[PDB]
Design a protein around this ligand. Structure first.
Ligand code: MG
Ligand code: MG
Ligand code: MG
Ligand code: MG
Ligand code: MG
Ligand code: MG
Ligand code: MG
Ligand code: MG
Ligand code: MG
Ligand code: MG
Lengths: 109, 175, 62
RNA sequence: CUAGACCGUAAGGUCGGGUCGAACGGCCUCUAGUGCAGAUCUUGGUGGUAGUAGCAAAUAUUCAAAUGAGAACUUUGAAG
């Protein structure tokens, strides 16, 4: 289909970080969004915006938000490309609340 | 020159070596045995899968108290590992041997690992510090590695007097 | 690049700690060439190295 | 070095092949620092154990970029 695409996802970080030790909730939330963008875009190479890292780490290593709105953009890998030709770039979307939002495709134009 | 015992055509063979390579001898031995006899491109694709943890290296000899894995079912063993450091050294030498085969003029689609042998290099010495003011050795086990690729190639009888007489008696009544 | 030396130089030149020294990540090559205190001083005035204002400790609740 | 041959009951002796490169034997006598499996023997070298025991105190790391053949660990920025 369309190998280049951008979509809005809500990740339930509450169910993914449930029962995880406190000193690695925020590092594991990093890895869960990495597995999340790999499960939705089919790309091994997942790249996280530093401002998304700020949103994960905003309330410390222990206080990752229960829900998080993400913008996952599958793009074409260049600049001495790796084994894969496509990659996922995950951005945060600034919203008042991360509740009640469904998956929606966002157009590039 | 002066490799191990090889029984192949030297004119149809290309070789590669690496000496004093600081990689575990035990793990390099099993990685070498996992591609011994395979086709070159099959062996190279398999080692890439070992790097990706899709396929494992069966640990056959130096394997006591190794963990078990599902990926040993491919070879009929419970104990198999993924010696990434050993794999990289081996596939570097496979890439060098295929370069020698190309330089020599050998046809790469028919190549296969005919001989691969990992030997113990001289060990590198370090110390470790134990309880009650004791010092013990802390020693590397490097590997001598050598491999060869080759193309895939496509009575006087004595009888007594009574034995000959029977054969004579069989013939003069046979149809 | 190893801009560790420049961050040490910028802290001593500006007069603050290394924790308050900002080096432009988009100007790595320019900071790399600056090996003298006079060259770090030149980088301070053209904005490449800034003073990174203090973390506030309010006494409003006090 | 040699699951190749011969001689001697044996200690041993002799030969063929491989490897090697500069000295070495038979016999009659002389002489000894003259024959090793042990001595928790001496010195050196190597194993099984074993890719094992383990590399768990000092709250804690994460993201991107740069450099590089290669970055969990280098540099910078952001965050905690
Ligand atoms: Mg629990
Ligand atoms: Mg056991
Ligand atoms: Mg164990
Ligand atoms: Mg085990
Ligand atoms: Mg110790
Ligand atoms: Mg000579
Ligand atoms: Mg004596
Ligand atoms: Mg002895
Ligand atoms: Mg272990
Ligand atoms: Mg600690």
């Amino acid at each position: 289909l369309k190998d280049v695409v951008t979509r809005e996802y809500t990740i339930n970080l509450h169910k993914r970080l449930h029962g995880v030790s406190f000193k690695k909730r925020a590092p594991r939330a990093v890895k869960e969004i990495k597995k999340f963008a790999k499960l939705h875009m089919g790309t091994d190479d997942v790249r996280l915006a530093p401002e998304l890292n700020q949103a994960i780490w905003k309330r410390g290593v222990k206080g990752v938000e229960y829900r998080l709105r993400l913008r996952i953009s599958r793009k074409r890998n260049e600049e001495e490309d790796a084994k894969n030709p496509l990659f996922s770039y995950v951005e945060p979307v600034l919203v008042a609340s991360a509740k009640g939002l469904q998956t929606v495709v966002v157009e590039e134009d | 020159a002066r490799y191990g015992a090889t029984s192949t055509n030297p004119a149809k063979s290309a070789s590669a070596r690496g000496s004093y390579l600081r990689v575990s001898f035990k793990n390099t031995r099993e990685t070498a045995q996992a591609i011994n006899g395979w086709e070159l491109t099959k062996a190279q694709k398999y080692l890439e899968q070992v790097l990706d943890h899709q396929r494992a290296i069966p640990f056959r000899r130096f394997n006591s108290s190794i963990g078990r894995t599902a990926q040993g079912k491919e070879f009929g063993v419970t104990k198999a590992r993924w010696p990434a450091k050993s794999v990289k050294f081996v596939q570097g030498l496979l890439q060098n041997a295929a370069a020698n085969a190309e330089a020599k003029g050998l046809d790469a689609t028919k190549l296969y690992v005919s001989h691969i042998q990992v030997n113990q290099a001289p060990k590198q010495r370090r110390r470790t510090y134990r309880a009650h003011g004791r010092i013990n050795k802390y020693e590397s086990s490097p590997s001598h590695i050598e491999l060869v690729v080759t193309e895939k190639e496509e009575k006087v009888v004595r009888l007594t007097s009574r034995q000959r007489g029977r054969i004579a008696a069989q013939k003069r009544i046979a149809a | 690049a190893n801009l560790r030396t420049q961050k040490r130089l910028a802290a001593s030149v500006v007069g603050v700690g290394k924790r308050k020294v900002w080096l432009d990540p988009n100007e790595t090559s320019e900071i790399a060439q600056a090996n003298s205190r006079n060259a770090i001083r030149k980088l301070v005035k053209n904005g490449t190295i800034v003073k990174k204002a203090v973390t506030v400790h309010s006494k409003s609740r006090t």
